[PDB]
Design an enzyme around this catalytic site. Sequence first.
Site, PDB file in Angstrom:
ATOM      1  N   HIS A  49       0.767  -1.517   0.049  1.00  0.00           N
ATOM      2  CA  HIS A  49       0.048  -0.030   0.039  1.00  0.00           C
ATOM      3  C   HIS A  49       0.714   1.244   0.063  1.00  0.00           C
ATOM      4  O   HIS A  49       0.417   2.234  -0.243  1.00  0.00           O
ATOM      5  CB  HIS A  49      -1.093  -0.026   1.146  1.00  0.00           C
ATOM      6  CG  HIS A  49      -0.769   0.297   2.175  1.00  0.00           C
ATOM      7  ND1 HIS A  49      -0.188  -0.516   3.273  1.00  0.00           N
ATOM      8  CD2 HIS A  49      -0.246   1.674   3.159  1.00  0.00           C
ATOM      9  CE1 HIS A  49       0.058   0.214   4.504  1.00  0.00           C
ATOM     10  NE2 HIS A  49       0.061   1.448   4.173  1.00  0.00           N
ATOM     11  N   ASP A  76      -0.541  -7.464   1.969  1.00  0.00           N
ATOM     12  CA  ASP A  76      -0.053  -6.268   1.744  1.00  0.00           C
ATOM     13  C   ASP A  76       1.433  -6.247   1.864  1.00  0.00           C
ATOM     14  O   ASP A  76       1.902  -5.517   2.760  1.00  0.00           O
ATOM     15  CB  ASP A  76      -0.624  -5.394   2.781  1.00  0.00           C
ATOM     16  CG  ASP A  76      -0.404  -3.965   2.599  1.00  0.00           C
ATOM     17  OD1 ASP A  76      -0.073  -3.571   1.591  1.00  0.00           O
ATOM     18  OD2 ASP A  76      -0.443  -3.299   3.779  1.00  0.00           O
ATOM     19  N   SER A 111       4.212   1.598   8.503  1.00  0.00           N
ATOM     20  CA  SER A 111       3.788   0.593   7.524  1.00  0.00           C
ATOM     21  C   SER A 111       5.085  -0.047   6.847  1.00  0.00           C
ATOM     22  O   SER A 111       6.008   0.721   6.452  1.00  0.00           O
ATOM     23  CB  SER A 111       2.867   0.812   6.379  1.00  0.00           C
ATOM     24  OG  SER A 111       1.601   1.300   7.070  1.00  0.00           O
ATOM     25  N   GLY A 112       5.061  -1.254   6.389  1.00  0.00           N
ATOM     26  CA  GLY A 112       6.201  -1.771   5.894  1.00  0.00           C
ATOM     27  C   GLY A 112       7.333  -2.187   6.694  1.00  0.00           C
ATOM     28  O   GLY A 112       8.306  -3.088   6.355  1.00  0.00           O
TER      29      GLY A 112
HETATM   30  N1  LIG Z   1      -3.472   0.924  12.836  1.00  0.00           N
HETATM   31  C1  LIG Z   1      -2.298   1.889  13.235  1.00  0.00           C
HETATM   32  C2  LIG Z   1      -1.433   2.482  11.744  1.00  0.00           C
HETATM   33  C3  LIG Z   1      -0.405   1.619  11.463  1.00  0.00           C
HETATM   34  C4  LIG Z   1       0.135   2.046  10.397  1.00  0.00           C
HETATM   35  C5  LIG Z   1      -0.225   3.168   9.645  1.00  0.00           C
HETATM   36  C6  LIG Z   1      -1.412   3.980   9.844  1.00  0.00           C
HETATM   37  C7  LIG Z   1      -1.850   5.021   9.204  1.00  0.00           C
HETATM   38  C8  LIG Z   1      -1.416   5.146   7.932  1.00  0.00           C
HETATM   39  C9  LIG Z   1      -1.987   6.151   7.164  1.00  0.00           C
HETATM   40  C10 LIG Z   1      -2.446   7.315   7.813  1.00  0.00           C
HETATM   41  C11 LIG Z   1      -2.768   7.050   9.132  1.00  0.00           C
HETATM   42  C12 LIG Z   1      -3.256   8.383   9.830  1.00  0.00           C
HETATM   43  O1  LIG Z   1      -3.539   9.654   9.189  1.00  0.00           O
HETATM   44  N2  LIG Z   1      -4.110   8.383  11.082  1.00  0.00           N
HETATM   45  C13 LIG Z   1      -4.794   9.581  11.957  1.00  0.00           C
HETATM   46  C14 LIG Z   1      -6.129   9.542  11.605  1.00  0.00           C
HETATM   47  C15 LIG Z   1      -6.972   8.642  12.363  1.00  0.00           C
HETATM   48  C16 LIG Z   1      -6.650   8.740  14.024  1.00  0.00           C
HETATM   49  C17 LIG Z   1      -5.667   8.659  14.057  1.00  0.00           C
HETATM   50  C18 LIG Z   1      -4.913   8.356  15.629  1.00  0.00           C
HETATM   51  C19 LIG Z   1      -3.883   8.662  16.194  1.00  0.00           C
HETATM   52  C20 LIG Z   1      -2.832   9.017  15.264  1.00  0.00           C
HETATM   53  C21 LIG Z   1      -3.174   9.273  13.815  1.00  0.00           C
HETATM   54  C22 LIG Z   1      -4.329   9.161  13.287  1.00  0.00           C
HETATM   55  C23 LIG Z   1      -2.204   6.049   9.927  1.00  0.00           C
HETATM   56  C24 LIG Z   1      -1.957   3.392  10.922  1.00  0.00           C
END
Ligand SMILES: NCc1cccc(-c2cccc(C(=O)N[C@H]3CCCc4ccccc43)c2)c1
Length: 228
Positions: free
Chosen positions: A41, A85, A179-180
Amino acid sequence: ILGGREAEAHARPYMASVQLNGAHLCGGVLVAEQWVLSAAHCLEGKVQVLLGAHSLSQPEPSKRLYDVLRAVPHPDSQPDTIDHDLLLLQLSEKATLGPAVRPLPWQRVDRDVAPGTLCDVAGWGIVNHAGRRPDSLQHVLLPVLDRATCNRRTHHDGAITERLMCAESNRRDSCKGDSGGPLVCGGVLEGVVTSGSRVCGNRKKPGIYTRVASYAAWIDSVLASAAA
Ligand SMILES: NCc1cccc(-c2cccc(C(=O)N[C@H]3CCCc4ccccc43)c2)c1
């Protein structure tokens, strides 16, 4: 990485920063001299891989930037699922190996890690909900969450297949730009971070990691073809 701590510089010599147009985009794992495993991704510009690094910005003797000759997504990956992925990046040349640049053995025995086990996840992803980016590599220890729990409707509602594993996400978690990168247990690569829910650090939405052991044939065949 949320809720973590600074990594020891160069202590995880498989760690890679996958870069797009000169900026850290995703983590990756050096798995052979000329190959980095990461997440498909992430590549949804000029893709490069920085090896040997601790600081993204500061001069370090082991740091070396590599162009990417080929990007090989898993052939069953798709933009609308979390499945398969995985991404294999072939470097422009064999990396110069050393104390700071070494491949990580990855698990071939296809057996789940025991729930409750703490595994180590590292990256240059964001470090807080504000989106602050760290200059140096961070890491965190996270407990493996059992699949039956992770698949409950309140959590990931059936989406956790046998080829996926979960870790707890209570405050401590992987996040955007991780990620990755690797989930390492007992010194061996078990998981590759995927983004799951975009929500980080909320116990209700566990972290999801692709189980490398499930994909041994794919990795072996991609590398063997290139070696022909
Ligand atoms: N499962 C987790 C995880 C692991 C790998 C990639 C990401 C990932 C990849 C791309 C964008 C986002 C993103 O912008 N998150 C934001 C908005 C939502 C709520 C939230 C809460 C805490 C910190 C950030 C965010 C996250 C998330």
